[PDB]
Paper text:
Full-length GRP78 consists of two major functional domains, an ATPase domain and a protein/peptide-binding domain. First, there is evidence for the relocation of GRP78 from the ER to the cell surface in numerous cancer cells, where it has roles in promoting cell proliferation and metastasis (and references therein). Third, engineered agents that fuse a cytotoxic agent (e.g., a apoptosis-inducing peptide or taxol) with a peptide specific for the protein/peptide-binding domain of GRP78 can bind to cell-surface GRP78, become internalized, and cause cancer cell death. This finding raises the possibility that, similar to the protein/peptide binding domain, the ATPase domain of cell-surface GRP78 can be developed as a novel functional receptor for delivering ATP analogs across the cell membrane. Therefore, we studied the ability of GRP78ATPase to interact with three ATP analogs (i.e., 7-deazaATP, AMPPCP and 2’-deoxyATP) and the known substrate/product (i.e., ATP and ADP) by using surface plasmon resonance and x-ray crystallography.
To confirm that we can introduce the substrate ATP and its hydrolysis product ADP into the crystalline form of GRP78ATPase by using a soaking strategy, we grew the crystals of GRP78ATPase in the absence of the nucleotide (nucleotide-free crystals), and then either ATP or ADP was soaked into the nucleotide-free crystals. Unexpectedly, soaking the crystals with ADP resulted in the active site containing electron density for an inorganic phosphate (Pi) and Mg++ in addition to ADP. A possible explanation for this observation is that Pi and Mg++ were co-purified from recombinant protein expression E. coli cells and co-crystallized with GRP78ATPase. Therefore, the ADP structure of GRP78ATPase appears equivalent to the structure of ATP hydrolysis products and will be referred to as the ADP-Pi-Mg++ product structure. Superposition of the metal-free ATP and the ADP-Pi-Mg++ product structures shows the γ-phosphate of metal-free ATP is found ~3.4 Å away from Pi in the ADP-Pi-Mg++ product structure (an Cα-RMSD value of 0.43 Å). Alternatively, the Pi in the ADP-Pi-Mg++ product structure, while still coordinated to the bound Mg++, is located in a pocket formed by Thr37, Lys96, Glu201, and Thr229. The ADP-GRP78ATPase interaction was as strong as the ATP-GRP78ATPase interaction in the untreated condition, as indicated by their similar Kd values. However, the ADP binding affinities were significantly different upon the addition (23-fold greater) and removal (159-fold lower) of Mg++. Therefore, the ATP-GRP78ATPase interaction seems to be insensitive to Mg++ concentration, whereas the ADP-GRP78ATPase interaction depends on Mg++ presence at the active site.
Numbering used by the authors: 26 to 407
Write the structure that this text describes.
Amino acid sequence: DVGTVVGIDLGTTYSCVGVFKNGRVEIIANDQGNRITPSYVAFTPEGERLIGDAAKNQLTSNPENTVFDAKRLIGRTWNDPSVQQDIKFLPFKVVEKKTKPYIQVDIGGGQTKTFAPEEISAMVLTKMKETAEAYLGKKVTHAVVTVPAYFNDAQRQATKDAGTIAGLNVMRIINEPTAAAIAYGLDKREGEKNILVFDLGGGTFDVSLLTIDNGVFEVVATNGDTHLGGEDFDQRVMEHFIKLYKKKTGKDVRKDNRAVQKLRREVEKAKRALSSQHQARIEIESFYEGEDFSETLTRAKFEELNMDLFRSTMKPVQKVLEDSDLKKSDIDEIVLVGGSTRIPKIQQLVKEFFNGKEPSRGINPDEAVAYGAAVQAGVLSG
Ligand SMILES: Nc1ncnc2c1ncn2[C@@H]1O[C@H](COP(=O)(O)OP(=O)(O)O)[C@@H](O)[C@H]1O
Ligand SMILES: [Mg+2]
């Protein structure tokens, strides 16, 4: 008895959970009211473990005791060159244990803990499970979980193992771009079609060329950039306001961490607002040395600050086409995935790359992966 199976997007930066109820997919909001949840862990001084928004939102001078981006490490060996490169950029300690890159943090009272990447991912799945259980009013035991198309055997198995730790029987692992296609019902079509999935997220960018024939998907080619997404657009805005503040006041903002943390949170909020309005205000009381911060950002300035990065996303699309032996006119469906595809300019540039062809529309792009997982979960719940 699998009960109500949940569909989970276990994301590098943001995760999402959905279920099939009363004849449709329902994307479930967490206890902070959000339909996506940061893949983030932290600790209080008392040694309480925070997960999700509360973890990411906790003001700290000790980023070395937060954990995030565990998906970059999951199912890999310590000596994997990808791991050895990624640990340069992660503020928390990673140590070799049982051949793997375990995460070592202080959690309160001088207590040290060491966690496998799949134990961190298990904490995130637990939070997703709790989110679904609160919505459903009952326990959940089974899940469909998505992974990037490029995940190998160890990465898939380690994702299943994270489920096991979280008390979730991972019944099916499905590829993220495929899950998005399923969300749009592209599996339920006749003839053979070429689908280009453009997935621009928080820290990661994935482009995938899928074919669909008689209900069966094949991932023909993949590309992208493992360190390009909305976090980078935020940093460009940060640099803009840090330089302006120095020019204005003479002071170097970066000397104070919690200040940088406050500006980052407000910059991210502003960026999101600018996907649906043309100006946003950034305001922070007691920003730096007792002085308040108050500035505006226009959509045009946001675009100007990131135009080169926005344009760089086309190169991996051109590469998957060449690797697929396809031209632009061979693409039958374009699917936008990832939170950063909410950016109007990103939509515009993809459409222009495809000579005016409209993408699929109607599912929030940061939810589309979980949506498709939930579709499959619906069938499995019966
Ligand atoms: N309305 C929006 N406008 C611009 N960016 C957004 C919007 N909503 C979410 N984002 C960005 O999407 C990114 C997260 O993408 P998502 O696909 O949810 O994460 P992941 O890459 O971890 O799967 C973040 O940088 C977030 O700031
Ligand atoms: Mg994603």
